[PDB]
Symmetry: none
Subunit: 314 residues, 4 copies
């Protein structure tokens, strides 16, 4: 079974994400990293009656030990938004956080699956790749920008409008994770759904700005933590099931891609033992959906460039 | 199709508990109450792709709306311990919180299952019962002091020592929830385990002081939260399974009892459609376990009387 | 010339108290101790344009370095109250904190003035004294329970009612620091003030419950911090000035005594180079005030015994 | 008889600031505003034996009552930096906070002195000015960006290197408050000091990034709070002294200026009853200092226009 490392385990996302991972029979070893509180979070989780052995590591001195033999590394670490902030306002802090932590992964568990939640994902994935490139252990099949929350939100909002059980809805979401770059493919939704354009546009904008909606609702107490923990655990479970030989596992994720002109893009991915087995690509989309893909590419390029430029300055 | 209310849903226990409940197909409605942050927590959780309708309530005016029509109310509300404190040290603050919240339950959802997590459970359950008596709606088959975390700990520690799958381990734990009153019935464990005496003594002590162990490890940042969320969720699920007619559902819980001279006591309970179907009692125990029961009684009685006396000062 | 150590410098009282000490011409060196955040606190304060050299220490291993050569040790360390709690609810944690910290003082700066702010003062001073006795380093003229806040409050409340400037009001307060052990001597007030018995009783009760009123006003966010830092600073400045040879320095403080049948009591103290120069005693009091002293004695003796018995068990 | 309002009085800066203001004989009315905790902060502070009347206000509804008849308004409200953030990263959040609070000032106490601590000061003072203009109550003599912490730091560092008492050191700092816009005029220091060129660049670098060093030293637990409180208090005292007719009070502050190409600039100001009595200007500076001024102007203009643009789209 899998050894999973959580970098930033003591934060708002990290604690409940670590709880969901500990509850899973797919995990046998769970290592927790942060700069504060980890030993306490680990002692807490270690009492839970599941097989996953839990250990907390504190400070960069113990970071190498945390990473040894890891099959998957999830990185919820990062500063959350306050009302008013854009995801780009977090770029500077989260870029150096992701740069520092992915360097440690490249040095200590370069063969591991790397799942980045830290925002803005549209720049932090490029950063992760370039950091891995500079260490000479670059593998684009094992680096994932976790955009799963966008799919989870689309499913819920569609299900609510159509009176369906969200657990049986699937809405592909492509592009990236910002405004802007979030493209819900309602045309490719299962079960098949039918919305008027004004209702479709409202639904689309709702999915696009759902992160901001939660920031407003929290009124300065941060951004999505619990739903983000759910989405992160879902993606890790999908990846680990696939690594154990489960067939047909498809998740959208922001990865190194030659699907569009963007070197990085989020599409549905067939997962497996090497990570990305096959990029299933964008597929058949509406004219409305195609317009969005075109409007988003400009921003994606900037975000990719910004992230790549940041690594060169190091 | 269960409707569940969480009173204290914005706290360290409450948030991860609410996440676990939201993730469950047993829950169709999840109402969250606190004095702060509930709208943000509910907005966060409402995005998760499960059927449970989530709503946040804030302030005294909204508490009745939160409770109306509930099948189960879980009360993690309360102040946590710091290193050096006993659970009894929290009595004066948490007794008032439990009194107020359980009074609201007696008025607005008297038929619901009331699950009290707030410590010290040995006194706050007596408070809850007396509050329900005052409102003329006391049903001892529906008031539960959640001691599940002790069983979860016992399962984990037994499994670690013997090298077992803790999912397969069930250790009955009786008495109450405070240092000396926690009595692990290792002799009644399934699968049956034999420990040499020195391991048995260290194991029993470890279970009894497990809560203090986590408080120490957290070093001033509170008590167990994530494992208490796990334990609380587990107990709610067992209760909901029983209400849906599932047979053979057994959980230990601190309830109104006849087993000893203590009017409240924790034993294994067969659960059913109206809560406690049958108190299975203490059963056959070792001499060592019998001695531990004898030692627990005076402290239990003292904690029980304290709770009763507090209600008489209201 | 004075070197002052602050034990608990990162806490709610500790940070503002450290700020006030940093701003004083009397302090040459300011060492700050805590189990978290001290380096950031020391760095923050070291930027202030005063002569005191500031350094932050972190964890028990660095406590000896923090204490070496200290002239005055201030101990604001400890857990604050939440609404509902009494000061004795903090006993178990704050007793353990005080016994540990004062044991380090007795070893590493036995000659220093020990100013204890940690509550309950009526027990924590007896604890401090017993720890110094156990190390064979007894000086009852150097151990102070900081009750200054009671005098500060009394001054303010009298001043508000009579329309005076609180800066020019002085009210001796004797006894201890908990509920009815707080005995303000309004008869000895300067300037002379005329209160009828009904207003006198209201004013006295206000002074006695002032700490509880702040806890209620803070509604879960702790106890008095800023006013406590002010009073702690005032007492440390008075003590240091007396150590500089300043004449006629008098402050009420809870110390080991033989003024009443309590072996510990707060009275006006003439301070000097060796700490307590002379205990000025109670002086002449009204009948109302004599009754309060008599009613206070049972509670004080019990708190003293509780504190002393705590050290003997360790 | 100065009435002082503190907007953001419950924050890390606001609480110790409010304490220092409460301790001063210059203040007669102290009104505290925030969105949480102010009643408790005011209760705490109201016990201190000084004459300042203290009142806590809570939420936008009580903001007019807080500001009514104020002579000075100090605004420490704002999100603090975490390691890796620039002050400009805080812009979107803090620009909204400042625009809201200053609009209320313009509506309810338009003749008061407005002192903004909220970062980035280089943009937030322009926001304040434009907001006041939009209400037609613009007075450039009464709006102050509090840069005093830069001077306090410069004094301390100079004094440390030269073995001087920092209380009797004065180093003018000009420009703005962000990165290279901080320009310490070591050539104008009193007493006169000579530094070799290598030390001067190091000394200048230390002063420029001093805020960042405290952020890193706090390692995620915020930015400077206690030194900022000290600096905020110093500036308010200077300004209040001058309003009572005290002569020769000089402070550097980021104000509306015609001293450079920039609309706003920090230089030594002579303060008076009207606020800015006279802008004392940059004065004679070295070639090194002239170079820094030249390099800084492009960044200052950008920050200025950014803040102006923000208000122009409300």
């Amino acid at each position: 079974n899998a050894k999973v490392a959580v970098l930033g385990a003591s934060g708002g996302i990290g604690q409940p994400l670590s709880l969901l991972l500990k509850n899973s029979p797919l995990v046998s070893r769970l290592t927790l990293y942060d700069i504060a509180h980890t030993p306490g979070v680990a002692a807490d989780l270690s009492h839970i009656e599941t097989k996953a052995a839990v250990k907390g590591y504190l400070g960069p001195e113990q970071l190498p030990d945390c990473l040894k033999g890891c099959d998957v590394v999830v990185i919820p670490a990062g500063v959350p938004r306050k009302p008013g902030m854009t995801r780009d306002d977090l770029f500077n802090t989260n870029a150096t956080i992701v740069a520092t932590l992915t360097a440690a992964c490249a040095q200590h568990c370069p063969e591991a699956m790397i799942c980045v939640i830290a925002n803005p994902v549209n720049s932090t994935i490029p950063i992760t790749a370039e950091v891995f490139k500079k260490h000479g252990v670059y593998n684009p099949n094992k680096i994932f920008g976790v955009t799963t929350l966008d799919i989870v939100r689309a499913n819920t909002f569609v299900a609510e409008l159509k009176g369906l059980d969200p657990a049986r809805v699937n809405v592909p979401v492509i592009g990236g994770h910002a405004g802007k770059t979030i493209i819900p493919l309602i045309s490719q939704c299962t079960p098949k759904v039918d919305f008027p354009q004004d209702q479709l546009t409202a639904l689309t904008g709702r999915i696009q700005e759902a992160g901001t909606e939660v920031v407003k609702a929290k009124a300065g107490a941060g951004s999505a933590t619990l739903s983000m923990a759910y989405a992160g655990a879902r993606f890790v479970f999908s990846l680990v099931d696939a690594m154990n030989g489960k067939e047909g596992v498809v998740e959208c994720s922001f990865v190194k891609s030659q699907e569009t002109e963007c070197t990085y893009f989020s599409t549905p991915l067939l997962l497996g033992k090497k990570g990305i087995e096959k990029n299933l690509g964008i597929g058949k989309v509406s004219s409305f959906e195609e317009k969005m893909i075109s409007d988003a590419i400009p921003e994606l390029k900037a975000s990719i460039k910004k992230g790549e430029d940041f690594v060169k300055t190091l």
